[PDB]
Write a protein that binds this ligand. Structure first.
Ligand SMILES: Nc1ccn([C@H]2C[C@H](O)[C@@H](COP(=O)(O)O)O2)c(=O)n1
Length: 221
């Protein structure tokens, strides 16, 4: 007793986000956005003066987390413990922590069941860095979008350039390069594609083409 899926994962900046809003739009498939979750988890950790450094304090917060996602409106507002926090989880600090919050074995666990319960007819698209390596290791579909460092950098340090912020290519470069040698050497929660994941790059690829591509693989299998 279960419904179909998909597993569009990959590193930040890869544009796996907007890709999902098609997978899920053209298909009307429940769009599960992970990253956010952690981002709320981290936020909640922050305001709850919970020591995001202490793995011995990030599991309770998770296993009783009040985080849900809106329906079909303008885009997708994430809600927390009773109030909206979209713009706040998209902060340039919440992530530094949301990067800490997701680097602990037990964390994921408590977040685990909280995710697997997202599946439902017809299907559930899943943005993330592991929707195959762990959560949906049975998803007929398994896309793994990817993008170089210099580029994924642009794909961000620029994406926020016309959003009223200041940032330098040099920094964010290092910043993402950092998470890589982290996410990589990471032990658990690597970032390597699912042994049957369609490795799909997008550096010199267009977003209109990634969609194009992706979908091809979709209904196919
Ligand atoms: N499935 C996921 C999604 C995000 N993450 C991490 C990567 C980021 O530091 C943070 C949220 O990522 P994102 O900015 O893509 O929402 O949590 C993860 O480890 N596994």
């Amino acid at each position: 007793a279960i419904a179909p899926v998909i597993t569009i994962d990959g590193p930040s900046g890869a544009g796996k986000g907007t890709l999902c809003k098609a997978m899920a739009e053209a298909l009307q498939w429940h769009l599960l956005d992970s990253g956010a979750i952690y981002r709320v988890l981290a936020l909640a950790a922050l305001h709850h003066h919970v020591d995001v450094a202490s793995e011995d304090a990030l599991v309770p917060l998770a296993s009783h987390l009040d985080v849900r996602f809106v329906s079909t409106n303008g885009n997708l507002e994430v809600i927390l413990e009773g109030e909206d926090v979209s713009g706040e989880i998209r902060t340039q600090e919440v992530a530094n922590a949301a990067s800490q919050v997701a680097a602990f074995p037990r964390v994921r666990e408590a977040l685990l069941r909280r995710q697997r319960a997202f599946r439902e007819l017809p299907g559930l698209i899943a943005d993330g860095r592991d929707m195959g390596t762990v959560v949906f290791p049975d998803a007929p579909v398994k896309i793994f979008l990817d993008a170089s460092s210099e580029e994924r950098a642009h794909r961000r340090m620029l994406q926020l350039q016309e959003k009223g912020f200041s940032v330098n290519f040099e920094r964010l470069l290092a910043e993402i390069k950092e998470r890589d040698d982290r996410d990589r050497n990471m032990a658990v929660a690597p970032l390597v594609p699912a042994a049957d994941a369609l490795v799909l790059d997008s550096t010199t690829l267009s977003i209109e083409q990634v969609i194009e591509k992706a979908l091809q693989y979709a209904r196919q299998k």
